[PDB]
Amino acid sequence: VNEAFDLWQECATHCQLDLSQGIRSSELDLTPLFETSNEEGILHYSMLLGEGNEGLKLAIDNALTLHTTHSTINFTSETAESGPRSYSYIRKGENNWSLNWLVPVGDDAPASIKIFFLEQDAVGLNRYISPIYSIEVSNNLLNSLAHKSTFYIRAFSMVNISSAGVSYVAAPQQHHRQKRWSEWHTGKLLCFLDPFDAFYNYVTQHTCNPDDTWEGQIYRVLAGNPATLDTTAPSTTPAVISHRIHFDRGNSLASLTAHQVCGIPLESLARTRHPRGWEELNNCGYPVRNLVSLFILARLSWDRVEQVIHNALTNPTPGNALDDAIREAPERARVTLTLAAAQVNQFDNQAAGNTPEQAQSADVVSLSCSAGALHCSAPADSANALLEREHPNGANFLGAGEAVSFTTRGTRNWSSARLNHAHQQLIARGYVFVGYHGSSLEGAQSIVFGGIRTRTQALDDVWQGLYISGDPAVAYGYAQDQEPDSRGRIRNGTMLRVYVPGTATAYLYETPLTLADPEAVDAVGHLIGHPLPLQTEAITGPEEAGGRPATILGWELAEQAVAIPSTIPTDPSNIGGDLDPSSIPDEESDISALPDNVTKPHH
Ligand SMILES: [Mg+2]
């Protein structure tokens, strides 16, 4: 009796909802107020739960069910095809919290909903956020949640609901489809929603980039009276935001790897509503994902990727699909499988329970790292996920111009003027030039558009990291394919410039000892104040005895470094040749002053 209520009328402002007579339900009917026909954008459903928000069962249709206690918010969600999926959030707050869900609208829009909990301080200001949970659901649920759904609430006695309603923001149609939804699977999602932009700024100390986060799109209420203005606690301190991404297809590791190799937004490799086939996906995205899948099907150790590639190129099994896939694009296979192997090793080391094989289908957790902070600590509840740290990369610093791409005939759309502008933007953001990195065309695409990240390397564990040099002639030797293809051919590659955040300048060390020399290991340990390997440090020294300098960035520093293209071309007439110092533009030499490296330990 009197089960029914009207959330968007009675609880728009405030309602004390009676739970004493058993279950309460409200139709959330959007059909009168919003026609999803010819709309592309985001529905943001929210309500604030006050006193009596503990010991409740909440539901949206039969699709999403939440259980609340004082210390936890637990939920189970339906998925498109993989069956139900359960998450437990340990509360960071003790007072009110908002239930938020995002429903993307449009035939071309993403095939995931977002769920997240914003916890307030004692005085009712937004202070803490849960992980952003991304669930790939059926086309039917995506459509229904944008039309009519029912909200159920039950105790086991009343609950204070306020600011119940729904808002909408249209996707910007001036940006092509890939770019348009690029931040759907990042913490910058919060920058799409007017009430949370400043929350993101205060918690991450990163910009809400106008051109990447829909700035200027009108965020408007459709029903009820939801929170639209910022009410962020002014005392909010920096903290890592986590975005947990479920892949219904079970191909998370392959999709993550394709994102990192190709520099393609992770959303583009997610579930599609209707079979898509973007030019960037058919050329790089799908083939790279497919190579990881074929490697998994071969049942080979991730420790052996470089020997599997070598074997495929020099002593292949004819008609073996993995060998043939490697042979088609060997250098892409090197970048692809050494990235996936590093991700699998990192996953394995996150928990005793974790196995290489659980990595294949694990959720991705995207971490919004705090600007400048040298360490980006993962939340405890991310230990069962594939971690990717969001740091600015080269693509954020290319500035205005046509699309930059890497070819044997040279870097496209990359003038001295564009480099000077990029350099100026980097030093204005406190980044410091540390040297040149030579890579393959595919290596450059990955590092610039995907970001620098750990790859497995055939070398001593203690000397692992990104190998660069202050001397562009050293880098130049690596600015080509790492090994020949199946016909014994090597392509020229790309010269890159590498910049570290200014926060790392005290950890840029130098020794007269030879890098990668077993006899230098204890002396380098003494210099950096702990045994190798390098963490958030770099070491500079002779490449070989008496030789030219090189620099190793520890992988944890390298992740935070930015690579942009050099205007030093690779000469395709003289593949394997020495750098002609006459091919170095004076405008580049002028911006290439190197740091004052630390030569004695701090203590
Ligand atoms: Mg915004």
Residue numbers in the entry: 1 to 156, 163 to 609
Manuscript text:
Cytotoxicity associated with this family of toxins is due to their enzymatic activity and the ADP-ribosylation of eEF2.
We performed a search of public databases using selected hallmarks present in the amino acid sequences of the three known PLTs to identify six additional family members and performed structural and functional assessments of all nine family members. Despite having disparate levels of sequence homology, all PLTs had nearly superimposable structures compared to PE with pairwise analysis showing root-mean-square deviation (RMSD) values ranging between 2.3 Å and 3.2 Å (all atoms). Variation in the level of cleavage despite strong conservation of the consensus furin-recognition motif and the similar accessibility to this site in all PLT structures suggest that other elements might be at play in mediating the furin-toxin interaction. Remarkably, loops 1 and 2 of all PLTs superpose well with PE, whilst loop 3, which is conserved at the amino acid sequence level, presented more flexibility in our substrate-free structures and may regulate access of the catalytic site to diphthamide. Although we were not able to produce active toxins due to safety concerns, our structural analysis shows that elements involved in NAD+ binding and ADP transferase are conserved in all PLT family members, supporting their putative ADP-ribosylation activity.
